[model samples]
Each structure stands twice: as C-alpha cells, then as structure tokens.
Target: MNQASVVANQLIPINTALTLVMMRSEVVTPVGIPAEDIPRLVSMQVNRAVPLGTTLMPDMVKGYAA
Candidate 1:
C-alpha cells in the first residue's frame, strides 16, 4: 500500500542503521536486486499496474554481484 515516496522514506532509516553495522562501505549502500530477476520483476510490477500495454515495462537490469 505504500507509495514510492513512502517506501523510499522507510528505507532511509534502515539503510542508515545498516551502514553503521556493516563493514564494507558498499554494504552500507544497498545494491540492486539479483541482476537476472530485475527485468521479470519489473515486468510483473508494470503489468499489474497497467495491464493494457507492454510499452512501459522496465529495461533489463544488469550489474555487479556480491
């Protein structure tokens, strides 16, 4: 039920707490989800939000892994 702004707001506190306890600075800053899953996940999100069009689906995700 949370809007994007709400989700981002909640993450600030969590990310801050994680930054304090984690060793690697990269670990303090959260990374993207598993690269393989992002496209499919975003498609699901977009499709559910707007089922009529394929135009708004997110681009494929690619990134470094931990």
Candidate 2:
C-alpha cells in the first residue's frame, strides 16, 4: 500500500461502509440484546453477496480475513 500523506497528526481513519447512519442501534439495554436501537454500532464485520438489514452481527462476517 502506498503511504498516505501524513500531513496532520490526529487523523482517525473511518470506514465508509460502517458509518453511524448505516450502523446505528436504536437502543441498548442494561440486560438483553440492544434494540437495533434495531440497528447500530458494531463489533461484528460484514460479508459480500449477502442481503440483509442493518441489524448486522458476527456471523455475517464468518470468513473475515482482515
């Protein structure tokens, strides 16, 4: 990979495919799984060739190689 221009210091890279609007949860609870709040935040990765909603989870990225 080509080196990126390190012009500024505190640049945190973002994943365009994983932005907030595309991955936001409706509500998180103190107990059971969060409500989505029906759809955001992520610890899991995604895979191609799959069709689904933002309620993404770990199994979606089963063969992740990154």
Candidate 3:
C-alpha cells in the first residue's frame, strides 16, 4: 500500500494514553485511511517527541498510516 505524509498538529507526548482531539492541534489529514479511520490506528509505544510535521506510522512509536 502507498504511505501517506502527515503533519503533527501539536506536541504528542511519549508513552501516554493517546486520543484524537478534534479541537487540539493533534489534527491528522486523511491519507492511508479516511479521517474517521485515523483513531483506529494505534501504536505500541512512543519513544520520542512527535512534533509538528513529524512523520508517523501505526507500527512506529509515533504512528502508522493505514
């Protein structure tokens, strides 16, 4: 599957519970999956700071695109 490039809306913390905040900068553009499907993608762990424009995937500590 083709991967998608997305930008981090805000500072994503490491090793903490993650949620899709509609209001927060944690915005994610629809790429691999639809915007509604974004929340379905989960990560095992996050080791570093995921700042704005940081690439993410579902498998990595950051995120994995569908």
Candidate 4:
C-alpha cells in the first residue's frame, strides 16, 4: 500500500475536493492503497470530510493497506 494511498492530513470536503482530490499530492499516499482503489475509495467517500484517514472500509475500496 505504498504506491497510491492518501495523505493523513487535509480535511477533505465534498464536491470540490472530489474534483481537486484526484490531483492533490496530499491525496497520493506515501504509504498508498493504489490508484485504482483510490478513485473508488474517494467516490464512496463522496468527498466527505475524511479525517486523517477514512471511514470507508478498506475492503470496500480495496484495502487502505498503508
């Protein structure tokens, strides 16, 4: 999970964050969950305020293995 995971910061918001999220360097995990999972994870999150990590189950989004 060290390839495409998300950052452990940034209070992600709805809609706008969704658009900007896919490109945010912060969203790219230093200990990642893979780009493939990321899109699904974020989409499920619906740009909700992801605090430090996420609420969506990693299993649902392909595992937040980082």
Index of the highest-lDDT prediction: 3
Tell me how far the alpha carbon of residue 62 in candidate 3 is from the true structure, in angstroms, after superposition: 7.9
Candidate ordering by TM-score (highest first): 3, 4, 2, 1
Give per-residue lDDT, candidate 2, residue 2.
29
The candidate that wins on TM-score is 3
Tell me the spans in candidate 4 whose CA falls farther than 4 Å from its real position.
13-32, 46-49, 52-66
- lDDT string for model 1 (1-66, tens) is 211110111122211221211111111122323323323332122112222211221221122122
Task: List, residue by residue over 1-66, the lDDT tens digit for candidate 2.
Answer: 221211111221332233343442332222222333223323333443323233333334433322
Evaluate residue 53 in candidate 2 and report its C-alpha lDDT on the 0 to 100 scale. 31
lDDT for every model? Answer: 0.21, 0.30, 0.45, 0.41
Better of 2 and 4 by lDDT: 4
- Model 1 lowest lDDT segment of ten: 2-11
Model 3 ranges with Cα > 4 A deviation: 1-6, 22-37, 42-45, 62-66
Off by over 4 Å in 2: 1-16, 27-45, 49-54, 62-66
- All candidates' TM-scores? 0.19, 0.28, 0.43, 0.31
lDDT of 4 by residue, 1-66 (tens): 334444434555543333334423333423444445445445344334445454333432222343
Candidate 1 vs candidate 2: the TM-score winner is 2
lDDT (10s digit) by residue, model 3, range 12-33:
6776444554112224454323
